[PDB]
Design a protein around this ligand. Sequence first.
Ligand SMILES: O=C(N1CCCCC1)N1CCCCC1
Ligand SMILES: O=C(N1CCCCC1)N1CCCCC1
Lengths: 169, 169
Amino acid sequence: GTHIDLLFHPPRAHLLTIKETIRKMIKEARKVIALVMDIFTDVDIFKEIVEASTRGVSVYILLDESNFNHFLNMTEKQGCSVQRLRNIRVRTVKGQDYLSKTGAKFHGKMEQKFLLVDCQKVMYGSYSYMWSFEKAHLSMVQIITGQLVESFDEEFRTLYARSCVPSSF
Amino acid sequence: GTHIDLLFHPPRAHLLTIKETIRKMIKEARKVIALVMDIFTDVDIFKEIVEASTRGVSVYILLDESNFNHFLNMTEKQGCSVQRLRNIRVRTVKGQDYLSKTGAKFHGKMEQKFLLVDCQKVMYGSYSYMWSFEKAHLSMVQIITGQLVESFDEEFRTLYARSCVPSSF
Ligand SMILES: O=C(N1CCCCC1)N1CCCCC1
Ligand SMILES: O=C(N1CCCCC1)N1CCCCC1
């Protein structure tokens, strides 16, 4: 009871691009959007998310901690104060703590990305929401429906519990 | 007609780590191993692949072109001339060609990571074969059996057709 389609960028034998399919999923959302992403600088996908939030959709966004200031800078350059949108909550996730060769204390990255809409559909894969994924790289995603969506829901809730208010806020 | 399980690193309720499951999948290979990977520097996984090849398994490895020298540096440190193992073929894959504002022509990366064994089982996800994914980062994979495996086989063949002999070789 799980169904899976594959999409690629650049595209193959499918009608829509990965980015057009991301916009579609966000426009179709009626209740909740849950996003986990490492780098988020795409202005067009951000605008879709904000519009969803003005419609009354609750939006929860989990970003990798090291790269967060790239997202904040984009929203500021768009003249948005993302802090003030009540229907969106943005929080950061760190990787593991570790000691380097020299004994310094660092943390790694959250290498996870997926979009979960209305607890019924997931896009999961290697596509990051930034210009380099449009113009420079090859990538792929899965569009997932059915029972496996519950597992993504559970994982989102576990990451949300770990996540923190961004230090920049 | 597809079954999918999830594994995480650091590990959650499941018995084995991602790295232990990779070693397992390789040891269980009877005919063919097909691997697509962005960076490969983990010696223990490389030892497993070489041992599979000595028992007559055919091994096809596709590596992101921009990161290839990290692999080559590892195999040489280990005292292995990988280009002399006839049951292993290593080839590189480039991202898209694009032109920067300075005019110089560059290419991006292949952002794709999966292990396909005997045309029957796939490990797909965000885990790269390097020390940072053991000690520093949070990552996840899918373990896939059934009809979806066929789509991974098609994609492998498509990337293999695109791929090139590495310039060092
Ligand atoms: O409403 C949700 N969930 C439904 C959407 C997918 C999984 C998360 N959460 C978000 C995290 C704070 C607790 C409520
Ligand atoms: O025999 C294979 N395999 C590829 C797909 C998974 C296993 C079977 N190939 C490798 C790619 C070039 C031609 C032969």
